[PDB]
Symmetry: C4
Subunit: 91 residues, 4 copies
């Protein structure tokens, strides 16, 4: 399914960021995963990377990841959350 592919791609993208920021920025995996998530969702509740490699990766990560992550959120909202709500609203 479209949703299943987007879900997996999003997980892989977030794992990749988790590995990158935990390695290069010396973050605990949960901090690395959190940073990846608030970066790609554009929430941005975190200070900037300290290293030039962190900054370069983040620049490329944003352009590569944001379209995928927002596609996933759009399909989540449209093909999972919306039918669920409709179903919850029928007496």
């Amino acid at each position: 399914k479209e949703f299943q592919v987007l879900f997996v791609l999003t997980i892989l993208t977030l794992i990749s960021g988790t590995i990158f920021y935990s390695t290069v920025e010396g973050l605990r995996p949960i901090d690395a995963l959190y940073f990846s998530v608030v970066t790609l969702t554009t929430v941005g509740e975190a200070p900037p990377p300290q290293t030039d490699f962190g900054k370069i990766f983040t620049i490329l990560y944003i352009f590569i990841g944001i379209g995928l992550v927002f596609g996933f959120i759009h399909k989540l909202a449209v093909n999972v959350q919306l039918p669920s709500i409709l179903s919850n609203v029928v007496p």
Copy 2:
């Protein structure tokens, strides 16, 4: 109505975040509500949660809440703010 449902769902989602961050992050409700709002709107004018539970909740909260909150803002703008303005612009 569509707007009435989205409004309520948004309020429930924000109350849920308010309860969570006031409990786990030890925030005053207004700080907890503020954090919930700038998180789900992607404004992100706030430092990150201090606890791992805060970070995990925030990650899940973002993916679950963002589509709802942006749907609400879209319906607010399109079905409430726009007709109001049109009405204000007619002599």
Copy 3:
């Protein structure tokens, strides 16, 4: 015109925020205007309001202003920037 109305509405919304944050948060107008702009565009390159009134206003300001500001940016991009670019690309 649609663009002219959205432009004015956006200016009024930003003036309103500029007045609010310069008064309540004690910001210089330019700081107040900057905060209003990065808040409503969801850029969020600024620490949170210090006062509870700042936080409450910001919460309401976001939901009320974001749809207008993004409508303006959409019309700017679509009805001004895009025709300009097309025109620049014709030999």
Copy 4:
């Protein structure tokens, strides 16, 4: 191509921001480029400009650049990433 023009325009916009913030805010080019990218993508993982000229430029830069950058990300996602994925999903 539409994608080729949007790509170039985005690069020019980011170069322009890189030049501006490296000059006026005294940032190393990579910091200036990073700030330009997280500003225009609305990620906002960076403190505010220190100078009034930085703040004014950033205000104008956001309204002018955000529509272009999100148009580029939309065309990247829709006309490059989506066909690539479809192609990877066919047995």
